[PDB]
Amino acid sequence: GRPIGVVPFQWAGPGAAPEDIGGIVAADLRNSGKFNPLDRARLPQQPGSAQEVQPAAWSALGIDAVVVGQVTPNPDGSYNVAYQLVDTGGAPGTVLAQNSYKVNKQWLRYAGHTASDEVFEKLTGIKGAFRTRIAYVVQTNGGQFPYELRVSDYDGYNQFVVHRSPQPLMSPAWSPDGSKLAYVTFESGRSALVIQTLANGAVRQVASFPRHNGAPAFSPDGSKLAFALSKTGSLNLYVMDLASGQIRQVTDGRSNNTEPTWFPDSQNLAFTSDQAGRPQVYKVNINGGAPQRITWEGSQNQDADVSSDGKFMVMVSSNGGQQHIAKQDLATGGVQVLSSTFLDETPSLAPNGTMVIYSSSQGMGSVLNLVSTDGRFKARLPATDGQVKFPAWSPYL
Ligand SMILES: [Yb+3]
């Protein structure tokens, strides 16, 4: 990872800042796998601005850039979060980027992810995804409504419940605009696919044919929804035109075809099929043509997620007898196992393709994990009151 210094932000008010901003920026950069922040334990100093920054102390220590900041109170009850990125190495002392934000204590972490998104894109030329969110299902220890569809920042904080249920909920999927979630609920007794508007809580009932309805995915252009129905005896792909409520069948047969994911063209799909025996990933244009297998490595591959630029995909894969999240380059065919935990499942990619969120078993339970797509960084998300599954990473917001 690219060395970088991130200094704890300056605090000027009721002793003890409400949020460690520097800590959030360091975690974000580290989380992407693109940077290696100096441990707070080795910082050669704790400067407060684009002046107290002495390059040789850093510019020397293999760090050609430091982040400094200041968190100051407002009479309005809000706060002012400001950061400055100093260019040691090359032109020591220079300020490469800086900014300041007025936010409520509720949005302190958001201001922290805004700084990191700015610093990340200025230094890497890749748009940051630190202000994104994730959706997931938590089975708590409450008895009436054990299942809860929740949403939080990609890093697990600031979570909120979208919906509580007495019956199982699964496979949330974000609309491309980030305003709605599609998911499967068994509340009515049988499987049902619904779309819920986050702001409103309004729920649109989409499909509840006989049998199982599940694994939804919105096309990137917003005009269609793909999913799998097993009303034919086995799962097959259907796509619904959201502007006309129209539904078309895409695959047919005795084989199971499910877990669709869209290529950037909103016309092609990668999906899981047990056609060849053990699950493998195939691709098909929904307008026509025969599906083509695309995973030839590994004994088994499934539940793919194609990146936003279509350069690669991540999936659940079996290599050397073990199942982990792996990624496959869609141009070269190169494959690389990214995770190393137990029973890795349902991987979802950040909108900039730099991180993947997935679940793994934990004792009798389940938790979420993040692994950078270059494979460098691995971390468990914050624990919550319950076992967690089916994470879905939101598009840019
Ligand atoms: Yb998936």
User: Which of 193, 194, 263, 267 minimizes the C-alpha distance to 230?
Assistant: 193
In the chain, how many domains are there? Answer: 2
| Ligand 1 centroid distance, CA of 315 (Å) | 8
| Ligand 1 centroid distance, CA of 22 (Å) | 33
Domain with 96, as residue range(s), is 1-131
| Ligand 1 centroid distance, CA of 136 (Å) | 12
| Ligand 1 centroid distance, CA of 304 (Å) | 6
Is residue 251 located within the same domain as residue 306? yes
Q: What CATH number does the domain containing 109 carry?
A: 3.40.50.10070
| Ligand 1 centroid distance, CA of 67 (Å) | 36
The rounded distance, in Å, linking the Cα atoms of 250 and 264 is 18
Is residue 332 located within the same domain as residue 393? yes
Is residue 245 located within the same domain as residue 357? yes
Three-state SS letters, the chain = CEEEEECCCEECCCCCCCCCHHHHHHHHHHHCCCEEECCHHHCCCCCCCCCCCCHHHHCCCCCCCEEEEEEEECCCCCEEEEEEEEECCCCCCEEEEEEEEEECHHHHHHHHHHHHHHHHHHHHCCCCCCCCEEEEEEECCCCCCCEEEEEEECCCCCCEEEEEECCCEEEEEECCCCCEEEEEECCCCCCEEEEEECCCCCEEEEECCCCCEEEEEECCCCCEEEEEECCCCCCEEEEEECCCCCEEECCCCCCCEEEEEECCCCCEEEEEECCCCCCEEEEEECCCCCCEECCCCCCEEEEEEECCCCCEEEEEEEECCEEEEEEEECCCCCEEECCCCCCCEEEEECCCCCEEEEEEEECCEEEEEEEECCCCCEEECCCCCCEEEEEEECCCC
| Ligand 1 centroid distance, CA of 30 (Å) | 25
Is residue 160 located within the same domain as residue 301? yes
| Ligand 1 centroid distance, CA of 305 (Å) | 6
Helices 108-124 and 21-31, interaxial angle, to 10°?
A: 40
Q: Of the residues 73, 106, 131, which one is the last residue of a structural domain? A: 131
Q: Count of alpha carbons within 13 Å of 288, Cβ hemisphere only?
A: 0
The answer to whether the beta carbons of residues 376 and 30 sit under 8 Å apart is no
Is residue 120 located within the same domain as residue 145? no
| Ligand 1 centroid distance, CA of 68 (Å) | 39
Strands 169-174 and 160-165: unpaired
| Ligand 1 centroid distance, CA of 170 (Å) | 11
First-to-last C-alpha distance (Å) of the chain: 27
Convert 13-32 to b/e letters by CB count within 10 Å (16 or more is b). Answer: eeeebebbbbbbbbbbbbbb
| Ligand 1 centroid distance, CA of 363 (Å) | 23
| Ligand 1 centroid distance, CA of 95 (Å) | 42
Is residue 221 located within the same domain as residue 327? yes
Is residue 125 located within the same domain as residue 169? no
| Ligand 1 centroid distance, CA of 37 (Å) | 31
Is residue 189 located within the same domain as residue 268? yes
Q: What CATH number does the domain containing 276 carry?
A: 2.120.10.30
| Ligand 1 centroid distance, CA of 88 (Å) | 42
| Ligand 1 centroid distance, CA of 40 (Å) | 37
| Ligand 1 centroid distance, CA of 52 (Å) | 48
Is residue 289 located within the same domain as residue 154? yes
Q: Of the residues 131, 160, 177, which one is the last residue of a structural domain? A: 131
Q: Of the residues 101, 131, 161, which one is the last residue of a structural domain? A: 131
| Ligand 1 centroid distance, CA of 303 (Å) | 5
| Ligand 1 centroid distance, CA of 158 (Å) | 24
| Ligand 1 centroid distance, CA of 326 (Å) | 13
| Ligand 1 centroid distance, CA of 319 (Å) | 19
Is residue 227 located within the same domain as residue 125? no
Q: Tally Cβ neighbours within 10 Å of residue 303.
A: 23
Q: Count of alpha carbons within 13 Å of 60, Cβ hemisphere only?
A: 7
| Ligand 1 centroid distance, CA of 355 (Å) | 15
| Ligand 1 centroid distance, CA of 173 (Å) | 9
Is residue 63 located within the same domain as residue 121? yes
| Ligand 1 centroid distance, CA of 172 (Å) | 9
| Ligand 1 centroid distance, CA of 346 (Å) | 5
| Ligand 1 centroid distance, CA of 309 (Å) | 17
| Ligand 1 centroid distance, CA of 235 (Å) | 15
Placement of tokens 């009303």 in the chain: 231
| Ligand 1 centroid distance, CA of 241 (Å) | 20
| Ligand 1 centroid distance, CA of 163 (Å) | 20
| Ligand 1 centroid distance, CA of 347 (Å) | 6
The answer to whether the beta carbons of residues 314 and 305 sit under 8 Å apart is yes
| Ligand 1 centroid distance, CA of 261 (Å) | 7
Is residue 44 located within the same domain as residue 5? yes
| Ligand 1 centroid distance, CA of 246 (Å) | 23
